[PDB]
Homo-oligomer: A and B are copies of this chain.
Amino acid sequence: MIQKVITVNGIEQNLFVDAEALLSDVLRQQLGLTGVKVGCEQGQCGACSVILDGKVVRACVTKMKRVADGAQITTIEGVGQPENLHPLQKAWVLHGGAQCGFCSPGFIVSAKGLLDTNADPSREDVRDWFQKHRNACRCTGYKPLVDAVMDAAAVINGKKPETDLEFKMPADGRIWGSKYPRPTAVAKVTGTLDYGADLGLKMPAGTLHLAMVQAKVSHANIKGIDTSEALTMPGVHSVITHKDVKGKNRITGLITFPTNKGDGWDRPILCDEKVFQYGDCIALVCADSEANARAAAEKVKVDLEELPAYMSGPAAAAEDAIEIHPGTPNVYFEQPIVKGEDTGPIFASADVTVEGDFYVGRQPHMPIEPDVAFAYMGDDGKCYIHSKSIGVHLHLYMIAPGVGLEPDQLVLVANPMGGTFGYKFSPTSEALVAVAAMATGRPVHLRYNYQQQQQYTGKRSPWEMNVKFAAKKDGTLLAMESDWLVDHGPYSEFGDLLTLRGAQFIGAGYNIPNIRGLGRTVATNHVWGSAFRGYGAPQSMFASECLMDMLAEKLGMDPLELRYKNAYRPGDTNPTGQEPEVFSLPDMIDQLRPKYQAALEKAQKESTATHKKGVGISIGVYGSGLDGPDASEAWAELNADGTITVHTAWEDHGQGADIGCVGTAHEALRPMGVAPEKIKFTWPNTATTPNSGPSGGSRQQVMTGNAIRVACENLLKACEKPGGGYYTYDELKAADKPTKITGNWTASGATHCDAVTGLGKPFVVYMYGVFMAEVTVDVATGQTTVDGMTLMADLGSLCNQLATDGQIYGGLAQGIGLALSEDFEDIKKHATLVGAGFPFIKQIPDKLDIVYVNHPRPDGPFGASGVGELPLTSPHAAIINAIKSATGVRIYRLPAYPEKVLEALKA
């Protein structure tokens, strides 16, 4: 051990450390500076950036031996605090740079380092700095972060007053549609919002820390578990196995379709008889620290009989493949789509037909914060779980029978969280922590490392797809045929539903009167399927939007004009036979047209012999809602202090549940003149917030936004004075009148799609958009650079523009990843950010352009649709269409790795 006397955030610290210890651990654990965020732990994400003697370093890869006596360290806590914000922190707030907020401390500390060395950077200088310092963000698409740096620099340079970093209320006093900052932004930019791992450090002494004993083969029969050596190891309390589970030890898919051949109870909580994928949790070590639990977990011995594993859909779907879940065929679900007339004769007599085989793979979510959860037994006898769940009520019912609790005896709460992008539509760690809390009676905390986040959370499910179009010479679509195979890994939850998305979204955007198709879901031993932003659209619309370009090529027609000819107009129906609710695609195409033509001309002029430029188009469509007559609930409560609490379970991945609530309520409460800072939101909790439903399906703004609107309308009625005006809280309480008022809303016009035909009216509100990608391909290396993305977006009406702009930039960046670099195919190689192709700042163009073409929705609150998933519906199709434009090469199977592109160029 060594004494080190240093200065941290301006205060002399008399430190006692192990010279081998990581600075991140010292700062977080010994000094309580949990504003230093840790994600990857491998020096790849910059979340743990700190200033050390004037240099920006990653604290997770800086040992204490590199910190000299007398060193100066700055963390986010030293940059500024609430009520003493630095210009960078004010700028972040103003520009909406904190979505999940997990990367915000590291970017801000890194930026301070930049500005201390270059007071007046160009935008390009800012991008070069964040690239060099590995500052990664999965939410924002980087552009808002650069905007914030530039604004702060101008203030620091005396070129503009600091007061201009503070939001100015619009003239009308309306925050709906404005850039009003989100309530959680100050806490995020100051490092004072506690995420799950931060909460773990601030839990009491009694708390047990868990480590997973995980399968290191993809498929096996389990013969036994020997814990004897682990029990003798430092700090070890106990080891938990399936024997300690008090219920069924299975997670239920809950809404398993009746035509599914499996019962939906296939997923274990702790493996008993079998390993179904690499990483499966077989046991939990409980110890005094994460480090001691992990060390002991390595000594637990599992006796296994390894079985042949099926690592892709086609492999597992073979007619003679062995049943992974004995008694259920590996192909466990099929969804037909049967619209209009038989397609065979129409294809035979059509002027033109095209066909393609496409593949979209196992995209990894890659939030900067790896999964984390904790649980405890309350003094009320109930089991409490605090996790990254974005469907607290959903998950309660998915896990309660398995853990052995009635629903009233379990409470699920959503912690502040550093992004999910859908992986938390699935249970991950909730049942594990519940089982351990119940078995030990003690508080328990489980943190995944980044390898476990990659290997042992669910993934976008690969789809192998064949799609065909028949059309007239003038471009009018006549018919479509479709076939898709969905590799869902071993656990069925929502796999059938994902497969149904193919019937709804393959070919969406166009009038197609005649469709015949079939989706099939298959169990495999690769990673189980969890929702990933877009949930079947990124697969479906990659195929159809690439195929539209192929059809345009075969017709000798411009691909934007082919889309114009076919885009939904009054009278048309979507693939499930439903009329669209608004008709904005022609408007969006007309507004994009001159920009597209100019981009074509620029690409022609600026192309060189070695660097070929191209422009690509696609349409995107997705529903806002869960299928059928989805619903939500909110309570609007006038508090004694005159503030209003809007109680919901709107789960915040980081997308903006806080600002969605405040902005929607503010608009609904305007008759009573309620200031936005007086409106409070509630963190999701199954005991004390209503069942607003999950934050999946780009649904909350529509469903919970409407419920909030109705609750607030009902509160206004409750407060109305006869003669005009409004009663105060004290007046209502004196009259023994209610102050907490419910609102509900249901998407009553919706129906579930039919099991035989696929037809129905699954959503009452959709999102619509048109993408344009501008790319350069180096034809010597095959490397593609995306130079610009544009999204024409119809969101109906914006609740908050900082929220929507950011959602779109984030989704476009994930689209660039999906197109060019991202997969989870190789269990080890793809288990790091860099290995799996995470997009760092230089991979995302600074030119991300949005054009809102909003057509107010009949059923949306104040006319709003959702936004969340719109920007990832088909940006990757636009990008691949642009590669084709540039070079003549079509990539059919994502991603467009350089070698793959080169092989196609040279064929």
Query: Does chain B have a CB within 8 A of A787?
Result: no
Bound-complex Cα distance A806 to B205 (A): 40
Bound-complex Cα distance A165 to B379 (A): 49
Residues of the B chain whose Cβ atoms lie less than 8 Å from the Cβ of A378: 1-2
Bound-complex Cα distance A203 to B29 (A): 9
**Residues 1 to 23 of chain A near chain B (Cβ within 8 Å):** 1-3, 10-19, 21
Query: Does chain B have a CB within 8 A of A194?
Result: yes
Query: Does chain B have a CB within 8 A of A586?
Result: no
Query: Does chain B have a CB within 8 A of A291?
Result: yes
CB-based contact A205/B2 at 8 Å = no
CB-based contact A14/B199 at 8 Å = yes
CB-based contact B205/A16 at 8 Å = no
Bound-complex Cα distance A194 to B8 (A): 14
Residues of the B chain whose Cβ atoms lie less than 8 Å from the Cβ of A29: 204-205
Bound-complex Cα distance A49 to B377 (A): 31
Residues of the B chain whose Cβ atoms lie less than 8 Å from the Cβ of A376: 1, 16
Determine how many copies of this chain the complex contains: 2
A25-46 contact mask (Cβ, 8 Å, vs B): 1 or 0 = 0100111100000000000000
Chain B residue at smallest Cβ distance from A204? B18
Bound-complex Cα distance A344 to B205 (A): 71
CB-based contact A204/B21 at 8 Å = yes
Residues of the B chain whose Cβ atoms lie less than 8 Å from the Cβ of A32: 31-32
CB-based contact B192/A16 at 8 Å = no
Bound-complex Cα distance A205 to B18 (A): 10
CB-based contact B18/A202 at 8 Å = no
Chain B residue at smallest Cβ distance from A65? B379
CB within 8 Å for A379 and B15 given contacts A30-B202, A30-B204: no
CB-based contact A194/B14 at 8 Å = yes
Closest approach, in angstroms, between the C-beta of A57 and any C-beta of chain B? 20
**Residues 203 to 262 of chain A near chain B (Cβ within 8 Å):** 203-206, 235
Query: Does chain B have a CB within 8 A of A187?
Result: yes
Closest approach, in angstroms, between the C-beta of A17 and any C-beta of chain B? 6
Query: Does chain B have a CB within 8 A of A308?
Result: no
CB-based contact A82/B30 at 8 Å = no
Residues of the B chain whose Cβ atoms lie less than 8 Å from the Cβ of A203: 16, 30
Query: Does chain B have a CB within 8 A of A452?
Result: no
Bound-complex Cα distance A206 to B192 (A): 27
Residues of the B chain whose Cβ atoms lie less than 8 Å from the Cβ of A2: 378-379
Closest approach, in angstroms, between the C-beta of A742 and any C-beta of chain B? 22
Query: Does chain B have a CB within 8 A of A289?
Result: yes
Closest approach, in angstroms, between the C-beta of A71 and any C-beta of chain B? 15
Residues of the B chain whose Cβ atoms lie less than 8 Å from the Cβ of A192: 11
CB within 8 Å for A204 and B16 given contacts A1-B443, A2-B378, A376-B1: yes
Bound-complex Cα distance A801 to B443 (A): 54
**Residues 558 to 616 of chain A near chain B (Cβ within 8 Å):** none
Bound-complex Cα distance A291 to B507 (A): 66
| Of listed A12, A14, A84, residue having the most chain B CB within 10 A | A14
Query: Does chain B have a CB within 8 A of A859?
Result: no
Chain B residue at smallest Cβ distance from A14? B194
A375-396 contact mask (Cβ, 8 Å, vs B): 1 or 0 = 0111100001010000000000
Query: Does chain B have a CB within 8 A of A288?
Result: yes
A79-90 contact mask (Cβ, 8 Å, vs B): 1 or 0 = 000111000000
A interface with B by C-beta (< 8 Å): 1-3, 10-19, 21, 26, 29-32, 82-84, 187, 192, 194, 199, 202-206, 235, 288-289, 291, 374, 376-379, 384, 386, 413, 443
Bound-complex Cα distance A377 to B374 (A): 36
Beyond the given pairs A30-B202, A205-B289, 9 more chain A to chain B contacts, judged by CB atoms under 8 angstroms and listed by A's residue number, are A1-B378, A3-B384, A10-B82, A13-B194, A14-B199, A16-B199, A19-B379, A32-B32, A288-B288
Chain B residue at smallest Cβ distance from A17? B204
- 27 A-B interface contacts by CB (under 8 A): A1-B204, A1-B378, A1-B443, A2-B378, A2-B379, A3-B384, A3-B413, A11-B82, A11-B192, A12-B187, A14-B194, A16-B199, A16-B203, A16-B374, A17-B204, A18-B206, A26-B204, A29-B204, A29-B205, A30-B202, A30-B203, A30-B204, A31-B202, A32-B32, A205-B291, A235-B288, A288-B288
Chain B residue at smallest Cβ distance from A443? B1
| Of listed A83, A84, A205, A374, residue having the most chain B CB within 10 A | A205
Closest approach, in angstroms, between the C-beta of A524 and any C-beta of chain B? 39
| Of listed A19, A26, A374, A379, residue having the most chain B CB within 10 A | A379
Bound-complex Cα distance A84 to B11 (A): 13
Bound-complex Cα distance A83 to B80 (A): 13
The 10 A-B pairs of least Cβ separation, nearest first, read A32-B32, A1-B376, A30-B202, A1-B443, A16-B203, A11-B192, A14-B194, A18-B204, A2-B379, A19-B379
Chain B residue at smallest Cβ distance from A15? B202
Closest approach, in angstroms, between the C-beta of A523 and any C-beta of chain B? 38
Closest approach, in angstroms, between the C-beta of A8 and any C-beta of chain B? 11
| Of listed A21, A32, A378, residue having the most chain B CB within 10 A | A32
Bound-complex Cα distance A374 to B203 (A): 25
Residues of the B chain whose Cβ atoms lie less than 8 Å from the Cβ of A199: 14, 16
Residues of the B chain whose Cβ atoms lie less than 8 Å from the Cβ of A291: 205
Residues of the B chain whose Cβ atoms lie less than 8 Å from the Cβ of A15: 202
User: Contact partner of A377 among B1, B10, B413, CB < 8 A?
Assistant: B1
Bound-complex Cα distance A13 to B199 (A): 10
| Of listed A18, A29, A192, A202, residue having the most chain B CB within 10 A | A202
Residues of the B chain whose Cβ atoms lie less than 8 Å from the Cβ of A413: 3
Chain B residue at smallest Cβ distance from A202? B30
| Of listed A26, A83, A204, residue having the most chain B CB within 10 A | A204
Closest approach, in angstroms, between the C-beta of A354 and any C-beta of chain B? 56
Residues of the B chain whose Cβ atoms lie less than 8 Å from the Cβ of A235: 288
Chain B residue at smallest Cβ distance from A416? B14
Chain B residue at smallest Cβ distance from A34? B32
Closest approach, in angstroms, between the C-beta of A65 and any C-beta of chain B? 9
Residues of the B chain whose Cβ atoms lie less than 8 Å from the Cβ of A374: 16
Residues of the B chain whose Cβ atoms lie less than 8 Å from the Cβ of A377: 1
Bound-complex Cα distance A384 to B83 (A): 42
Residues of the B chain whose Cβ atoms lie less than 8 Å from the Cβ of A288: 235, 288
Bound-complex Cα distance A578 to B439 (A): 79
Closest approach, in angstroms, between the C-beta of A196 and any C-beta of chain B? 11
Residues of the B chain whose Cβ atoms lie less than 8 Å from the Cβ of A3: 384, 386, 413
Closest approach, in angstroms, between the C-beta of A24 and any C-beta of chain B? 13
Bound-complex Cα distance A384 to B14 (A): 14
Bound-complex Cα distance A412 to B190 (A): 39
Bound-complex Cα distance A32 to B84 (A): 21
Closest approach, in angstroms, between the C-beta of A907 and any C-beta of chain B? 58
Bound-complex Cα distance A3 to B205 (A): 15
Chain B residue at smallest Cβ distance from A11? B192
Chain B residue at smallest Cβ distance from A288? B288
Residues of the B chain whose Cβ atoms lie less than 8 Å from the Cβ of A26: 204
Bound-complex Cα distance A16 to B373 (A): 13
CB-based contact A443/B16 at 8 Å = yes
